[PDB]
C-alpha cells in the first residue's frame, strides 16, 4: 500500500490511524525555537487590527482606516519579547500585543497569483502556512495613558 495516500482519521492532529510499527505553544517560545533552535525561515499569517496607529500618507484622505495598503516600504515597527511571556509590537508611539491565533491543522498554501498579462497569468506557490498570529491594541495602556 502507498504510504502517502492512507486513510485519514477525523482528528487532523492524529491522522496516523495505522503505523508502520500536542501542548498549546506560546508566541515567545515559538519565536525562540524558530530562531534559536533552528534557522530555517517560516511563513506566518498575522491578523492586524482594522485601523493602524497612523495616517494615510498623501492618499487624499477624515480619520479613515489606515491599512498596510497605504503605508510604504521599510521598517514600520519593532517586535519586543519581554519577560514572563509578553510579546508586544511597537508600531510607533503605541504598542500592540501579539497572541497565538486558532491552531489550524488543515492545509494552508500561501501562493502568489500574478496576472502579468491580460490573457495569461502565473500562479506562484510561495509556501505553506502553519501558525496564525493575532495582533490587538493594548486597550488597558491606552486607557491608563489618558
Amino acid at each position: 500500500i502507498i504510504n502517502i495516500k492512507k486513510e485519514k482519521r477525523e482528528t487532523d492532529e492524529e491522522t496516523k490511524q495505522i503505523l508502520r510499527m500536542l501542548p498549546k505553544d506560546v508566541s515567545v517560545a515559538e519565536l525562540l525555537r524558530e530562531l534559536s533552535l533552528t534557522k530555517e525561515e517560516e511563513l506566518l499569517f498575522l491578523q492586524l487590527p482594522d485601523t493602524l496607529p497612523g495616517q494615510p500618507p498623501t492618499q487624499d484622505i477624515a480619520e479613515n482606516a489606515c491599512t498596510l495598503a497605504d503605508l510604504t516600504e521599510g521598517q514600520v515597527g519593532k517586535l519586543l519579547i519581554r519577560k514572563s511571556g509578553r510579546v508586544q509590537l511597537l508600531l510607533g508611539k503605541v504598542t500592540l500585543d501579539v497572541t497565538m491565533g486558532t491552531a489550524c491543522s488543515f492545509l494552508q498554501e500561501l501562493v502568489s497569483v500574478g496576472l502579468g498579462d491580460s490573457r495569461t497569468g502565473e500562479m506562484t506557490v510561495l509556501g505553506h502556512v502553519k501558525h496564525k498570529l493575532v495582533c490587538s491594541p493594548d486597550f488597558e495602556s491606552l486607557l491608563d495613558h489618558k
Partner: protein
C-alpha cells in the same frame, strides 16, 4: 470508526473487491485495500455491581 475519502471528503464504507476487503466511497472511484488488522474498540461501561440497601 468513521473514515473519509481524501479525494472528496465523503464517508467511506467497507465492501469486498476482487482480491480483498476495501474501503470505498460512493461518489468517486477512490478505494483503499486493507493490509493488516483494523479495530475500533468502544469499551462500554460495565454494569456496576449494585449493593443491597436497608
Amino acid at each position: 470508526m468513521l473514515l473519509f475519502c481524501p479525494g472528496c471528503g465523503n464517508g467511506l464504507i467497507v465492501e469486498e473487491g476482487q482480491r480483498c476487503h476495501r474501503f470505498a466511497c460512493n461518489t468517486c472511484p477512490y478505494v483503499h485495500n486493507i493490509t493488516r488488522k483494523v479495530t475500533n474498540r468502544k469499551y462500554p461501561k460495565l454494569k456496576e455491581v449494585d449493593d443491597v440497601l436497608g
